[PDB]
Design a binder for this molecule. Sequence first.
Ligand SMILES: *[C@@](=O)([C]([C][C]1[C][C][C]1)[N]C(=O)[C]1[C]2[C]([C]N1C(=O)[C]([N]C(=O)OC([C])([C])[C])[C]1[C][C][C][C][C]1)OC2([C])[C])C([N])=O
Ligand SMILES: [Zn+2]
Ligand SMILES: [Zn+2]
Lengths: 181, 151, 16, 22
Amino acid sequence: APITAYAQQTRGLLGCIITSLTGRDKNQVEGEVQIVSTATQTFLATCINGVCWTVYHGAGTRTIASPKGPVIQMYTNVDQDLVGWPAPQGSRSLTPCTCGSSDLYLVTRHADVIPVRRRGDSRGSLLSPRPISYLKGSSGGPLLCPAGHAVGLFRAAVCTRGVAKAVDFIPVENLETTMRS
Amino acid sequence: VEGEVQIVSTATQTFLATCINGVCWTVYHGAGTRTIASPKGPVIQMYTNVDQDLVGWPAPQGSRSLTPCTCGSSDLYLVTRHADVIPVRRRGDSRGSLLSPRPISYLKGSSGGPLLCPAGHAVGLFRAAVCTRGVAKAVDFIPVENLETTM
Amino acid sequence: GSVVIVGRIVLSGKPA
Amino acid sequence: KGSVVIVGRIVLSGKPAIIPKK
Ligand SMILES: *[C@@](=O)([C]([C][C]1[C][C][C]1)[N]C(=O)[C]1[C]2[C]([C]N1C(=O)[C]([N]C(=O)OC([C])([C])[C])[C]1[C][C][C][C][C]1)OC2([C])[C])C([N])=O
Ligand SMILES: [Zn+2]
Ligand SMILES: [Zn+2]
């Protein structure tokens, strides 16, 4: 079966704000990727192997609102731009990519999977370029291989006059590394 | 929710339609020049192409359009009218071999359905089954490129 | 006669 | 600071399905 995804919004601005302050979220969780927001931005967090990961430059060192109040980060790596929290009760976790693979697929905040060709250990060309706006808000999102296993997490856009041609990502290896740090 | 694949039927047969890039595509061998029904009355086909066995009206209500393949993978997946996914190896522009042959009735009513690539993107439209003794071992289809030119 | 849509299929499985 | 809040989800485990009439 092919990679397919769908999005669902679980709360709006006002609920998000309250939940951010109180740190107590009691909403049910489902899925591998969680759409996440701070008071400054929205990005994504991918659950890989029981751990909910995201881009440090988005999460900073903040805690994640949970049904039991705030939850401190398990992992924090400023240099590899990673932060990890225990995967929220209810989420399903992806597993790292076995057998490398050159054909990657970026899952966006809008639940679109777009082809990406690996051009190195941390960069891939967009088979079909898209405006930077399209990629906005999907940092921390997963880069999948044809099997649905996480290869990396979206970090940066290689923009050219408002259009992203390539994308920089953090390889799953860096996760495993960050974990033993 | 919105679906990309519609399960349509004429007085004589039931088949499928796939909305790609704004148009609800299906096989000429099932619809012909028939119109698609709607709350406002019947709507005429935007395209017809007997040579390609392709026809398409404007996308219905409660539908969403598929995106054409841009990776060009040959590891396809067929979606039947029962929503089963069948992996298919692309042998050619309009040909593909099932990765596991199925009885002929397993691919029935699926004409017009989509043939997706690993990314769930449209690679083509299921045109017909190439069976042997009643076992569908391969599939025939209308690549999206044709729909892209026709439109 | 007209082609009638008798059902729909969401490829992502979205129940929402 | 405040807490990161989950405002939605993206599900990949879903598979093709025939949308129910009701
Ligand atoms: C992500 O955190 C965003 C998603 C981007 C916005 C368009 C896709 N990622 C970033 O904000 C990253 C962050 C910032 C700057 N980022 C960029 O992607 C910028 N590109 C960039 O830095 O490129 C190179 C130099 C190749 C690394 C990009 C931002 C938008 C305008 C064009 C430039 O600092 C890093 C790289 C860590 C989210 N919030 O959704
Ligand atoms: Zn893999
Ligand atoms: Zn593709």
